[PDB]
Amino acid sequence: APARCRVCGDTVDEFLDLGRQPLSDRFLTPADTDGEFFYRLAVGRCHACGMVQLTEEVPRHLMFHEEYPYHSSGSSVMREHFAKVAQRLLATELTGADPFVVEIGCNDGIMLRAVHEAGVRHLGFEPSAGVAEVARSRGVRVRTEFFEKATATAVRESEGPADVIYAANTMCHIPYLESVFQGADALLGPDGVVVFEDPYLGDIVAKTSFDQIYDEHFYLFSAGSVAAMAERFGFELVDVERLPVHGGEVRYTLARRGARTPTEAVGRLLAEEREQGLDDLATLRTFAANVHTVRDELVALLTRLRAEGHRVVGYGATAKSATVTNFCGIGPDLVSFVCDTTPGKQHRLTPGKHLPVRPAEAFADPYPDYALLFAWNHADEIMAKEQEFRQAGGRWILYVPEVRVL
Amino acid sequence: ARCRVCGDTVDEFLDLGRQPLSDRFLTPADTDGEFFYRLAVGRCHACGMVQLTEEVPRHLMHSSGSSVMREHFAKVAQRLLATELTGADPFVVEIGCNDGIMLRAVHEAGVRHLGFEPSAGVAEVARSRGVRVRTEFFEKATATAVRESEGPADVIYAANTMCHIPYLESVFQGADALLGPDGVVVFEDPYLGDIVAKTSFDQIYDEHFYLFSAGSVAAMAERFGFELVDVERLPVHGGEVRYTLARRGARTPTEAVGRLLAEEREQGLDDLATLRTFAANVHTVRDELVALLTRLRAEGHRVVGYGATAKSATVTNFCGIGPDLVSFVCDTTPGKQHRLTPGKHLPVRPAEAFADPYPDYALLFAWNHADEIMAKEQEFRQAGGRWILYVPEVRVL
Numbered sequence A: 001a002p003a004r005c006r007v008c009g010d011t012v013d014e015f016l017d018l019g020r021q022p023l024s025d026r027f028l029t030p031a032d033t034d035g036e037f038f039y040r041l042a043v044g045r046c047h048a049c050g051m052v053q054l055t056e057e058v059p060r061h062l063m064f065h066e067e068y069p070y071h072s073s074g075s076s077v078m079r080e081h082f083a084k085v086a087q088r089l090l091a092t093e094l095t096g097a098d099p100f101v102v103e104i105g106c107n108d109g110i111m112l113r114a115v116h117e118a119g120v121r122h123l124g125f126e127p128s129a130g131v132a133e134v135a136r137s138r139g140v141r142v143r144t145e146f147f148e149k150a151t152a153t154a155v156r157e158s159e160g161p162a163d164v165i166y167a168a169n170t171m172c173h174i175p176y177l178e179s180v181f182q183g184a185d186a187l188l189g190p191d192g193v194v195v196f197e198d199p200y201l202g203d204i205v206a207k208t209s210f211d212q213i214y215d216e217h218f219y220l221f222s223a224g225s226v227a228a229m230a231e232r233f234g235f236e237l238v239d240v241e242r243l244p245v246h247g248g249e250v251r252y253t254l255a256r257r258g259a260r261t262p263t264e265a266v267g268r269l270l271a272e273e274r275e276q277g278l279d280d281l282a283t284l285r286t287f288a289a290n291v292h293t294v295r296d297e298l299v300a301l302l303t304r305l306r307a308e309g310h311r312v313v314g315y316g317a318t319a320k321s322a323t324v325t326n327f328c329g330i331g332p333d334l335v336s337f338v339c340d341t342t343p344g345k346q347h348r349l350t351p352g353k354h355l356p357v358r359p360a361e362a363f364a365d366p367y368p369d370y371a372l373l374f375a376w377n378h379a380d381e382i383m384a385k386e387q388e389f390r391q392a393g394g395r396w397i398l399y400v401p402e403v404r405v406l
Numbered sequence B: 001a002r003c004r005v006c007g008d009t010v011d012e013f014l015d016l017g018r019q020p021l022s023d024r025f026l027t028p029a030d031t032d033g034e035f036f037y038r039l040a041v042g043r044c045h046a047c048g049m050v051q052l053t054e055e056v057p058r059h060l061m062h063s064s065g066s067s068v069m070r071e072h073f074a075k076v077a078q079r080l081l082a083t084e085l086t087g088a089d090p091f092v093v094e095i096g097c098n099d100g101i102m103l104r105a106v107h108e109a110g111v112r113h114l115g116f117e118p119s120a121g122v123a124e125v126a127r128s129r130g131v132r133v134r135t136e137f138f139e140k141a142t143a144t145a146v147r148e149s150e151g152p153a154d155v156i157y158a159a160n161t162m163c164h165i166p167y168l169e170s171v172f173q174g175a176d177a178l179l180g181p182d183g184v185v186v187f188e189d190p191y192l193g194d195i196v197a198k199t200s201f202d203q204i205y206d207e208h209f210y211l212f213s214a215g216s217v218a219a220m221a222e223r224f225g226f227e228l229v230d231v232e233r234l235p236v237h238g239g240e241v242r243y244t245l246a247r248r249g250a251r252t253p254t255e256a257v258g259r260l261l262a263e264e265r266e267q268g269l270d271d272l273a274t275l276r277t278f279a280a281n282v283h284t285v286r287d288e289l290v291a292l293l294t295r296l297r298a299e300g301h302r303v304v305g306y307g308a309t310a311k312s313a314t315v316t317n318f319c320g321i322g323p324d325l326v327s328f329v330c331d332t333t334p335g336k337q338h339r340l341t342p343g344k345h346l347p348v349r350p351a352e353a354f355a356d357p358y359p360d361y362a363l364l365f366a367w368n369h370a371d372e373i374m375a376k377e378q379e380f381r382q383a384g385g386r387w388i389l390y391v392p393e394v395r396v397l
């Protein structure tokens, strides 16, 4: 039995096998290492509805729990981004004298804080307690529960209809989309929409950014697959917008079928996907081959540098990096440690390959010869600020969209 | 009508009539001197450069006030630092640094730099941030002297400045003297493709002498011995492109350059007929806007303008929109408050005046900031107020 599609039930053709992987966000102490969870990370395309998806679901409680370490507000580019998201929704998707904004996955409340500060009624759903708490400390209302049909329906009954349900980097995390969209159907008001933004399949294929494939990214959405999924659930894809964040995303707007006229952007992006051949399983096999080439070149490079007696360190202990280190077999012999600004990631070992994580100050004591940039979506900001590294002769190693030394 | 780049003949395709200076806001008792010029635009048939047909005398003509641009220029500085200012002792020069937001980031990274900014007031603001500034125009002579005193530059950068300078040959001769071996000129300005696609004719006003495209920039570069080697679309200021020019043969154009030139072929942007279609669309916008405002006044509704943009002068004057059609314009800029807008003399009032009381319609001149403005005016929406937009077409929201 190959996979069955989690949207429509039909058969999924697997095209990339990334091997045995840990949970991306589970950093370890030495005592945890024997007990570490692993699963098989592989990606396939449903031949009927085109949805690209992982072939095994990781249980949601293992990934989303009290001590989930990713706080959205750590990143300044994302603070700016979500302020603008709040402005967009406030400007375009509110009706009447008491509108209501709901967010799935509001994390530390980055976006909804602005909605609150504008005096608009709102509610977040965030089952991870630690981040929920920080959101709450900013004045956001947050239910520490998973958004799904039942929870959404109950909120319709207490809080009334929602003008918009927004989700960033959350919808692709949720295999149970039918239940989310049943929820949305119950909760949304008459001109209500679901607006969600996630890592875009088109960007992943174009950039060979395979580190975007990890436990929390169950779906790799495209406009083609979203339009088909919406239809199945009695919704309709009515707007799309490309965003540059997180290595390349699309924001999808779904309305109940018939309620709105799809914008011209929708057809334009579909034509782009057709140009890219995104829906041809062959294009996806070519991507899988390019992934294997990146692995080969990156391991060869790190292996040479090790042989030359150079010091190589990683920069940014990203969630994505677990896929790289584990798929490529990169341990401490090839990358001595990883520098990271996140207090809870520091003084722990990275998932699966157990690279020690050190604070960002450790980068300078002394500077290494090479820095492997896992935090590649922040390349300009990082490379610009680390002047002394470059003055000491330091070189950057990048692996997106290909392996190169800068 | 002669091309300011190559000297060949320029074919006019849009005449926006008599216009004032776009930032010459009048006190109520000096509306008698008022300067007007003829604002029109043409394409050089030889090099393709799109440009105003009459230059506004330069003698008659604060970046960090906008949060969006402060954020943008932080990122520009990081881009330049990360990618072009590598080597032992690099040097970035900026043409038109204004209050120095961008170069402040360069200075704080410890990188040698120099801004050119002939406006003394902003130049001093830039100095107060630690930016090294010369209160001079960048041109062949001044650039050459900088080469002598400071050595070669890795980058010469300009934002919203190159398109204001008719004398580009002098700028590029300057860059040729001043740049190092692998040096580049990087400039970003409002993009002709976006103006045509959006019918955003309010981008056409005294300060914007050129409406650059990849095609016209490639031809200009080659004329001056440079080469278009990179491009990047930017969303700021209603749609821009950042062009990267290297000395001919020094670098290999990126795949982006080709892709943008393909977009321009798809758009037909180098066919005068396409530019005529744009002109016809501009006339339609005028017709539809004036018809709407006329009807709304006839229906007894109250209409206020929102944001006294420099660009808005083009709109009010071309469309003949005076205070009978729009009562005043609210604006957050102190230097503009309590003055009359150029040419059509719309009164300008602080933001607080919008809610005293709320009008029935608000005509959005600051259309680049639609979300930010509409998001913050919640009570206006709750009270049934509606927004009138004219980009990319006339409509009520």
Ligand SMILES: Nc1ncnc2c1ncn2[C@@H]1O[C@H](CSCC[C@H](N)C(=O)O)[C@@H](O)[C@H]1O
Binding pocket: A064, A065, A068, A070, A072, A078, A104, A105, A106, A107, A125, A126, A127, A128, A131, A145, A146, A147, A148, A167, A168, A169, A170, A173, A174
């Ligand atoms: N079914 C569900 N309902 C609500 N939130 C969920 C969920 N499943 C996962 N989440 C939350 O979704 C978030 C993924 S991380 C993305 C956070 C934030 N939206 C941002 O874009 O930066 C986590 O905070 C996780 O706890």
Ligand SMILES: Nc1ncnc2c1ncn2[C@@H]1O[C@H](CSCC[C@H](N)C(=O)O)[C@@H](O)[C@H]1O
Binding pocket: B063, B069, B095, B096, B097, B098, B116, B117, B118, B119, B122, B136, B137, B138, B139, B158, B159, B160, B161, B164, B165
């Ligand atoms: N030849 C020249 N050299 C240097 N600066 C010039 C110039 N001609 C005009 N300027 C300056 O260029 C600026 C154009 S306005 C744009 C300012 C800023 N770069 C921004 O993007 O916001 C003004 O500050 C003006 O004084």
Ligand SMILES: Cc1cn([C@H]2C[C@H](O)[C@@H](COP(=O)(O)O)O2)c(=O)[nH]c1=O
Binding pocket: A070, A315, A316, A317, A318, A319, A320, A339, A340, A341, A342, A345, A360, A375, A378, A381, A382
């Ligand atoms: C921008 C930036 C991020 N980081 C780290 C913080 C996060 O753990 C990580 C970004 O990855 P994330 O996308 O998993 O949040 O990189 C740094 O260490 N230094 C930096 O300058």
Ligand SMILES: Cc1cn([C@H]2C[C@H](O)[C@@H](COP(=O)(O)O)O2)c(=O)[nH]c1=O
Binding pocket: B306, B307, B308, B309, B310, B311, B330, B331, B332, B333, B336, B351, B366, B368, B369, B372, B373
């Ligand atoms: C963003 C914003 C701008 N404005 C004004 C300020 C400036 O005069 C003008 C912006 O024009 P500019 O883009 O030509 O600088 O609009 C407001 O009045 N309110 C606002 O909320």
Ligand SMILES: [Mg+2]
Binding pocket: A017, A019
């Ligand atoms: Mg296997």
Ligand SMILES: [Mg+2]
Binding pocket: A258, A259, A260, A261
């Ligand atoms: Mg329909």
Ligand SMILES: [Mg+2]
Binding pocket: A385, A386
């Ligand atoms: Mg530092």
Ligand SMILES: [Zn+2]
Binding pocket: A005, A006, A007, A008, A009, A010, A046, A047, A048, A049, A050, A051
């Ligand atoms: Zn399917």
Ligand SMILES: [Zn+2]
Binding pocket: B003, B004, B005, B006, B007, B008, B044, B045, B046, B047, B048, B049
């Ligand atoms: Zn010419």
